[PDB]
């Protein structure tokens, strides 16, 4: 097979990328042929240009993209490229890993990412783990609302337990306030556990407002989906400490390990498609001309390709194109500016890491041991 992978920024050529794949999966009857290129700097014009130019020198049937960047747009651009080449592309970190619009069905694209419902589920699991039964949701008109409410309504509703939803608040960041209408709503809520959903910046404003309201203070606790923490590299301390939020793993997969997983997915998919039809996946890569004939067959591969496994570990994707079995970490804001991992969560299940002692004895009905 013919494959290509790219790394952007860090100002470096790095041995570890060969080290990454360390000639991984050589055992597989089909061998990966890899061409590596890096670019110090990225552009939609630059990125668009380089991969196709690489199509001309490599004629690769798959691509993995990786970046040092915090940039949202890159992933989406790559989705467009998937639509354009009909050549699979995936990404293991940064912007490509960052969430994107619902992918075109015809398009083939993969990200090391996730969705909104799943995140809400993790928030619920986290709350359940600490047994925080009573909570409220502060949300904004930002996309995904009341689908967030809806997902929560089903998840909270199904369970036998009597947990309480106290308030749901919808406030438009647009029509910015002299009234401190956000202060006026937020001040009202008495609940100990708050789920917040908004744009990162909006989170800054809402938190300043909460600090004024006194909602950030002890015994109340806040829980957040992926978006607010974002890169996690930069953290305005406007966020209160003890803020609990979910984010992609880091110490679980090295940039090189993640690339190895990607190569493994592409070549495992190639192997499964081979096993099924005994047919070479290799296709003409050139974007400029019309898409190569027999590229349409690749379609079946994707339908087949959605779940790919290596190392007894699932890379399985989901219809959106996010890992169908993506991996995730429970993170908290450690004192000062630190983001420190706390729990790990994957697939269905999650795992996270005046006293006056009293003694008694069991009696008839008074004190009963069961």
């Amino acid at each position: 097979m013919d494959i290509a992978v790219i790394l952007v920024g860090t100002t470096e050529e790095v041995a570890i990328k060969d080290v990454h794949e360390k000639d991984d999966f050589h055992h597989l009857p089909v061998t990966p042929r890899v061409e590596l290129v890096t670019m110090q700097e990225s552009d939609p014009k630059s990125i668009i240009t380089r991969i196709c130019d690489l199509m001309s020198d490599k004629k690769v049937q798959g691509v993995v993209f990786g970046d040092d960047t915090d940039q949202e747009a890159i992933a989406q651009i790559l989705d467009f490229i998937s639509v354009q080449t009909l050549t699979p592309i995936l990404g293991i970190h940064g912007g490509s890993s960052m969430i994107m619009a619902d992918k075109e069905e015809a398009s083939m694209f993969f990200q090391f990412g996730p969705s909104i419902e799943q995140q809400a589920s993790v928030m619920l699991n986290i709350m359940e783990e600490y047994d925080w039964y009573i909570f409220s949701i502060v949300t904004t008109y930002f996309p995904g609302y009341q689908d967030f409410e809806n997902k929560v309504r089903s998840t909270i509703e199904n369970s036998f337990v009597g947990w309480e939803l106290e308030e749901v608040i919808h406030l438009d960041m647009s029509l910015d306030d002299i009234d401190s209408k956000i202060q006026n709503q937020l001040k009202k809520l008495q609940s100990p556990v708050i789920l917040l959903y908004c744009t990162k910046e909006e989170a800054t404003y809402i938190f300043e407002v909460a600090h004024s309201v006194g909602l950030t203070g002890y015994g109340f606790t806040w829980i957040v989906p992926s978006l607010v923490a974002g890169d996690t590299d930069t953290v305005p301390d406007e966020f209160p400490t003890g803020l609990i939020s979910v984010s992609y793993d880091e110490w679980d997969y090295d940039l090189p390990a993640r690339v190895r997983d990607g190569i493994a997915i592409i070549t495992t998919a190639a192997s499964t498609m081979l096993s099924e039809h005994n047919s070479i996946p290799q296709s003409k890569s050139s974007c400029n001309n019309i898409q190569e004939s027999r590229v349409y067959e690749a379609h079946m591969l994707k339908r087949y390709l959605i779940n790919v496994t290596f190392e007894g570990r699932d890379l399985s994707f989901s219809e959106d194109g996010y890992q169908m079995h993506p991996k995730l970490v429970i993170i908290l804001l450690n004192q000062e500016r630190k983001w420190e991992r706390v729990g790990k969560y994957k697939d269905r299940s999650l795992k996270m890491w005046e006293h006056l002692s009293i003694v008694t004895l069991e009696e008839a009905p008074f004190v009963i041991v069961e």
Binding site: E117, D147, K151, R153, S154, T155, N158
Partner: protein, 188 residues
């Protein structure tokens, strides 16, 4: 009129999938919203949870829950309050009584004792008391009193609690129900 019994033995209950609000309450009620039947004639208790979804005809009869024991001080029985592994009190899981137990917070503790040793159907539940497998049986009177007459080996006791009226279901949009209630009263 043309009548066909609903496929599901259950009258109806909300169920299934999580996303948005998905599917609809299984059973004859579901047929009513679906339009499989435009009007529902059956012994249906009338409650608010259902009531928002559909219009309800005026009731023409009353009835409540009670207990059958072979010949229990109250709906609140210290004997219930003093449960015993030795003295069973039996019900059907997924029977509406169970919904009363789950939905209500005040007695929520008492539900679990009932949950133990549940029976699948009405005949088996009456039989257990008749077979003397279970010392007590809890169900709404309308089904139970007729049986109480049928054997007399078994008896109903206490005061109907958690009772309710029975009425004919129609969509709020259908005006015929306006006559129905008007007729129901005239029949009363």
């Amino acid at each position: 009129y043309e009548v066909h019994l609903v496929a599901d033995g259950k009258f109806g209950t909300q169920e299934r999938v999580n996303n948005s609000n998905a599917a609809a309450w299984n059973g004859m009620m579901g047929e009513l919203l679906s339009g499989q039947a435009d009007m529902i004639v059956a012994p249906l208790t009338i409650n608010n949870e259902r009531a928002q979804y559909i219009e309800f005809s005026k009731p023409f009869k009353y009835q409540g829950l009670t207990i059958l024991v072979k010949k229990i001080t109250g709906i609140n029985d210290p004997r219930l309050r003093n449960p015993s592994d030795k003295f069973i009190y039996a019900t059907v899981k997924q029977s509406s009584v169970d919904i009363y137990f789950r939905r209500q917070v005040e007695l929520s503790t008492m539900y679990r004792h009932m949950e133990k040793h549940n029976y699948e159907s009405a005949a088996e539940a009456i039989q257990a008391v008749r077979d003397n497998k279970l010392h007590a049986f809890i169900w709404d009177s309308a089904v139970l009193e007729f049986e109480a007459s049928q054997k007399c080996d078994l008896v109903t006791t206490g005061e109907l609690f958690f009772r309710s009226g029975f009425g004919i279901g129609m969509r709020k949009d259908s005006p015929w129900k306006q006559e129905v209630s008007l007729n129901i009263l005239k029949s009363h």
